[PDB]
Structures are given as structure tokens and as C-alpha cells.
Amino acid sequence: LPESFDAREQWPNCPTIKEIRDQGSCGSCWAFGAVEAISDRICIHSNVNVEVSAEDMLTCCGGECGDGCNGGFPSGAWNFWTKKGLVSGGLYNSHVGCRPYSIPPCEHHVNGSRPPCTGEGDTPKCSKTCEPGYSPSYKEDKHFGCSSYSVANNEKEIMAEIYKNGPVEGAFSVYSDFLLYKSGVYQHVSGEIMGGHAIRILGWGVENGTPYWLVGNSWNTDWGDNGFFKILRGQDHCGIESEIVAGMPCT
Numbered sequence: 001l002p003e004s005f006d007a008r009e010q011w012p013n014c015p016t017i018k019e020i021r022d023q024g025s026c027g028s029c030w031a032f033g034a035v036e037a038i039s040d041r042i043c044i045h046s047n048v049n050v051e052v053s054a055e056d057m058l059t060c061c062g063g064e065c066g067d068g069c070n071g072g073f074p075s076g077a078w079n080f081w082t083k084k085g086l087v088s089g090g091l092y093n094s095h096v097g098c099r100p101y102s103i104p105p106c107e108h109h110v111n112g113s114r115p116p117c118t119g120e121g122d123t124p125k126c127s128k129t130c131e132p133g134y135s136p137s138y139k140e141d142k143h144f145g146c147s148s149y150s151v152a153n154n155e156k157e158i159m160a161e162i163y164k165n166g167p168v169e170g171a172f173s174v175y176s177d178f179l180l181y182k183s184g185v186y187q188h189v190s191g192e193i194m195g196g197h198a199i200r201i202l203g204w205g206v207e208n209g210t211p212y213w214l215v216g217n218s219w220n221t222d223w224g225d226n227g228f229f230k231i232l233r234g235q236d237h238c239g240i241e242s243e244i245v246a247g248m249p250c251t
């Protein structure tokens, strides 16, 4: 395996890999890390381009994935993709796809022109219909995964999975010092535990002798490094290597 790897550069024909979304004021990271990686993989393994609906995942999976805006389980999300499939849907107010995200973008621990995020967010309804004007129907717009699996807490195997099949979803413990991340390789040194956070890992590298994972957060582009961040790799730091999940699209 190479010393560095950036899925964005390795699969130039898959622009979703470069995208950063905004989960808004809702604890839907579990759903976002999943639909983002799934969007990447659908393009990688059939290179069609589809903005997989975070709304569909967030609202229709139900208990199997956890508790909507109150948090969920990454592996459960990929299961939903294989069992019920996922329709298309872009950013809030984009009118792109069957079910665009219904929760407004906000400022995540940074100042900006958008309203500041306010944790309190209610899970939107599971509506099995597409926005007006969109074709085909909800049922016909479903994209299915043909496998849902968990990658071992093994640096090499995780790198190998990304290298071969594309970005994966992972999760780590968020402590307050992470909230102010701007650049460099993040290592937890201070701050209270905020809870588990699911994200999309799309590569790795070494910065100043420090091995890291290239990660895409779901807090818009004005947070962190253009929406992305790097975190220490190789020591299961904050559990970043403990809950990796992925899957392959059908056909």
C-alpha cells in the first residue's frame, strides 16, 4: 500500500468524493457518513452518479438504525441500503433528486452567515414520495447495496478496503478540543467527552512524521479544513479504527 492515498484524486470521475455536506441541527452523523460513502461507492462501482438521500436514510430506516436525529448506528445504516435501498436527494433547498435534505444548514462551532446550529432537532417524517416534478417514483428511485460489512480494527485492512473499494464510514469519540479543529493532524489532549460521531474516511497520509486518516466531516465547508480534517492513524485514537463499516452496491 502507498504511503498516502486520497480517494478524491484516485477517482476523479466521482465528484461526490470531494463533497462536504451539512447535517444541520440534528444528530444524523450516522446517516451522513453512510450516504456520503455510499454515493462515492455507487460511482466507483458502476463507472452512474447519485447524490444519495440523507433524508431517506435519516427518516425511513427506523429502529434498525437507531433513533434518527437522536443518533444511530453506522452498520445499521448500510443494512438499510441493502434491505430497503436509498433514493436520491441533494442538499437542503437544492431541489436535486427524489428527497433533498429537509434540515437547514447552520454554523457548527464557527461564525458565519448562516444561523448557529442548535442541537435540538426533530427527526423528519419518513415520506415515501419524491419532490414535485421529479421522476421516477420513490420506489423506482431506490438504489440497493448488495452487501453490508464491518472492517476489523486493523490499520492495514482499513487502508486496503479504502484503496480497493473506496471511502468507508467510521466513528470516533468527540471531545471538545476537536470542535475547534482548523488544520494539522488532530490528537485529543483536552475537553469533555461530547459523544460518538460518525464520519467518512477517504484516505490517509503523513504530516510532519505523523500518520493520519483523511476525513470528511458533515458540518459544512466553513468548519475545519474546508469541511475535512485529519486525525491520528495507527493507534485507534479516540476509537477512529474501532467501528469501520462499508458495503458494495448491487451489480
Ligand SMILES: *[C@]1(C(=O)NCc2ccccc2)O[C@@H]1C(=O)N[C@H](C(=O)N1CCC[C@H]1C(=O)OCc1ccccc1)[C@@H](C)CC
Pocket (backbone or CB within 6 Å): 023, 024, 025, 026, 027, 028, 029, 030, 031, 066, 067, 070, 071, 072, 073, 074, 119, 120, 121, 171, 172, 195, 196, 197, 198
Ligand atoms: C453523531 C452526531 O450527529 N453528532 C453531532 C450532533 C449534531 C447535532 C445534534 C447532536 C449531535 O450523535 C450522532 C450519532 O449518530 N451518535 C451515535 C450515538 O451516540 N447513539 C446512537 C444510539 C443512541 C446513542 C448512544 O448513546 O449510543 C451509544 C452506543 C455505542 C455503541 C453501541 C451501542 C450504543 C454514535 C453511536 C455514532 C458513532
